[PDB]
Symmetry: D2
Subunit: 262 residues, 4 copies
């Protein structure tokens, strides 16, 4: 079937990319970059995030595959030495598909919609002060650096560094974590990370400042005259192609704990 | 239908209990503390915790109701003044049922029989005196070697309890999962731990296996007893769920708001 | 003696400033913004930091007084109405001096020294922040996250607290280093815990690849390019406060975060 | 001079112990009653016992730590260097002193005083732990949770570390307070952040309802009934180490947690 391969930029990612295209030359797989069914990412998680947003409009007919050139990633779980096996396994078209939940970021000032794979942070452009609304009701009023709404697969990313909990991707939910919150007498926050299920809307409403630095995954720009920032578990899901059992907790173990065989 | 009422023990709770019983008497409601279909807890979350474990063999045929006599609890929603409105909505059967996930705790010993436990809040494992050292095995795969005070596995509804004090994340009780939080992990070179709380879905099994000491202080909610000659402690989301009689619409996040932020 | 008064810029601060100078000249008080011995800050903690950075060269000859026009701060403690008796006591020279430790920040590439009253943070200029933490000419860890924060004892109740740092009394001559979203994994293992360093201890931050950092000293943040080394140590200079009443540090902490 | 050696219990410690004593068969006499030099073999736990065993004469005793297992913060030296320590001990060495924690327990009778090398903790006797934290005769917060930990500077790398506390260099004469599973709701509001108190500061823990507490001092933990007040302050007494080579505190922290 149709496929394509993305690259990080360095010689290593480019060389391996050309190798796989050559390998698929002995199989009935039409190389296409405008309408593929199998997107392969070579490099790191950042490279995977780019490939996701590059084809976020066709997540329905695309199974993503990750290859890490450097250290082991959570989206890039295939080794460069296993590229030969990858080509032969991809040829038959035999693979189970695994779907991960996504985050729907809606900004209201014209309504814009963004799909997050890892997280969607909201900072200020001075002091960051907003009001957290959960399903059309007041929960708290945040003051600090910002807020981070993470996906299950994204819990191991920025969410982890912010003290958030690690959540298995089989769970369809989203997690809200604080970023350098100041818990004084005036601005009281929950402190603890908050995990929201489907059909739950987290609305971030401004207090006095309308300019907020809204970021989505690997993309961070400045939005102007913002009135409301909505968050909910998107109906859209990213599909992966598995040929080998590589448990999510193993990837967590090999990343943060230890990797004895490497 | 059959029902029973549990009381905290104080005057206000016992007083409210007697009047509710008399209230149900004016309808088709039989008092039965052996096989109740409805269990009403009057007091607090701790009192509600006792009522749960009192009928943990009949959770499939029981809809629980909580009434707080003091401060607001996550299980005891109803106000004592709403007891009159409660006794009538129950008699008519004008209510829906909501279910929260539970935690299954299996304790295996040396070959003596294993013992299983259900938790509404959480289940914790600590040492019997010295250092607490266990191997955390996730789905038959080793994850970390833990050294510290203990480990806490919490239910979704139990996240607002001991879990939160330990730095755990607050989960919505609709989510079928379980959360593992550390209790003062040394987290060094020899005993490297994840640090972050772990949220496990259904059909996932967390195995705690002894390294040296085989005696552990195992706690389930309010109950905490010493277990000797332990070879394995298994955690997994139970297939059994606790059922709540729903009348109003009290948001879980509002209860969190009223308890930790402001009321 | 030779004094001066700084203002936030608002109407309330400027009015109270003029109402203070008028009562100042009523006594033996020569206004001097060149050789001051008493600096009165009117506004908030942010206004106080400005008054501090305005006279870093002569900190050993100046006693500071903070008056909050807005909310109560750890520096601006005096009330807008308590400025009446403040004029009298300040003229007779009865106040006691209280000294707080300061943080020295040196950027290396000809060096560039900075003094901080609250803290000094180092973040990346866009990409990931990866540096090597060197304690006393010995490597301690390789950090990868949003950045690091070296806080003064008096600055612990500020940004340091938000980052999970500890609150230490300003009578302790030390500096505290806290992490900013450390990834803390295999190849970038970090201590996690906030580190408190005494005097004569030097914390050197060294780049790995990118040498462009967003160095921030208190209220200002400069995008330093071509950075080779960032050194932190407890400065020999200390800020002096004119003590009139008795307002305990832990009491100020209680009023802020505990209600 | 007079000396003595304590053992952990395992064969690795007792065998190494007997080998060292034979090495002083110099002008060194084995005296466990009035020693001038105390050598601990095993781990930090073994060292703690040796400390409390000779807390009567801390001013005239230099301690040496040897770890048969993994590296400790008090048990510095590896058994491979045990021989070189013998020749060096028989007296070319300096003396390093670490601060200690004084714990005072009042009842409702007399009072009890204890010295801690690592930390002192106070927990409940079964139910919820609820106390009032009083700093210098001034109320600070009403704590509710598992307990509170007051740690020495050298004890920060122990229980304090696991509780999310800050790491302090043992040259800083202070004490650190950390929380144990604080519920931190609207009725029981706590600071959350660890608190570092200097000398001459008294932290008083006062009961609210229950007066029975599980008070621990280092490795010892006993139940105290009818407690009226638990006072914390930096002790005037210090523990003396016999410094041989140069093993920095931060390097020792690195080898424990970073590696
Ligand atoms: N790969 N990539 N590109 C973007 C992804 O990086 C992840 N991320 C980020 S991006 C948010 C940000 O403000 N970064 C500021 C500087 C920075 N970016 C980093 C990216 C990776 C590791 C460290 C970083 N520090 N920060 C952190 C952090 N501290 N620890 C861990 N992961 C982070 C985040 O999930 C984002 O999706
Ligand atoms: N006064 N003044 N100006 C500079 C002071 O800001 C204090 N600070 C800062 S400055 C870092 C920054 O630029 N953060 C972006 C969002 C922000 N800026 C703030 C400034 C003051 C209070 C809260 C802020 N949040 N952040 C935080 C934070 N999260 N919690 C607490 N205090 C913070 C810090 O102590 C510094 O000395
Ligand atoms: N060695 N020795 N024995 C006494 C010392 O153990 C230190 N400690 C303690 S004692 C507190 C306690 O009663 N914990 C429950 C059982 C326990 N003891 C331990 C000792 C070392 C590591 C883990 C432990 N868990 N806990 C912890 C902990 N989690 N991480 C690190 N160090 C701890 C404490 O500093 C005390 O001085
Ligand atoms: N009856 N009854 N209640 C039992 C419930 O107490 C909750 N819990 C516990 S029980 C564990 C324990 O033995 N802790 C030390 C003594 C204790 N018990 C408490 C009960 C409530 C609040 C604080 C407590 N401290 N600890 C804590 C804690 N630190 N913060 C918050 N909640 C806690 C836990 O969810 C358990 O289900």
């Amino acid at each position: 079937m149709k496929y394509m391969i993305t690259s990080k930029g360095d010689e290593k990612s480019d060389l391996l990319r050309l190798n796989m295209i050559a390998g698929f030359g002995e199989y009935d797989m039409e190389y296409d970059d405008v309408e593929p069914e199998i997107v392969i990412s070579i490099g790191g998680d950042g490279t995977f995030l780019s490939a996701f947003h590059q084809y976020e409009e066709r997540l329905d007919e695309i199974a993503f595959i990750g290859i890490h050139t450097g250290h082991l990633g959570f989206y890039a779980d295939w080794r460069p030495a296993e590229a030969d096996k990858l080509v032969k396994l991809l040829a038959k078209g035999e693979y189970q598909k695994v779907s991960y939940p996504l985050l729907k970021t809606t900004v209201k000032y014209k309504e814009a919609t963004y799909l997050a794979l890892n997280e969607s942070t909201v900072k200020s452009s001075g002091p960051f002060v907003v009001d957290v609304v959960i399903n059309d009701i007041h929960f708290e009023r945040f003051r600090g650096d910002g807020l981070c709404m993470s996906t299950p697969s994204g819990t191991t990313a920025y969410n982890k560094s912010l003290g958030g909990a690690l959540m298995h991707p089989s769970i369809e939910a989203m997690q809200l974590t604080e970023m350098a919150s100041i818990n004084n007498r005036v601005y009281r926050t929950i402190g603890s990370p908050l995990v929201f299920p489907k059909h739950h809307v987290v609305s971030l409403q401004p207090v006095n400042d309308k300019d907020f630095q809204i970021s989505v995954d690997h993309l961070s720009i400045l939005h102007r005259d913002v009135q409301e920032i909505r968050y909910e578990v998107s109906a859209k899901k990213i599909h992966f192609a598995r040929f080998r059992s590589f448990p999510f907790w193993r990837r967590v173990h090999d990343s943060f704990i230890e990797d004895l065989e490497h």
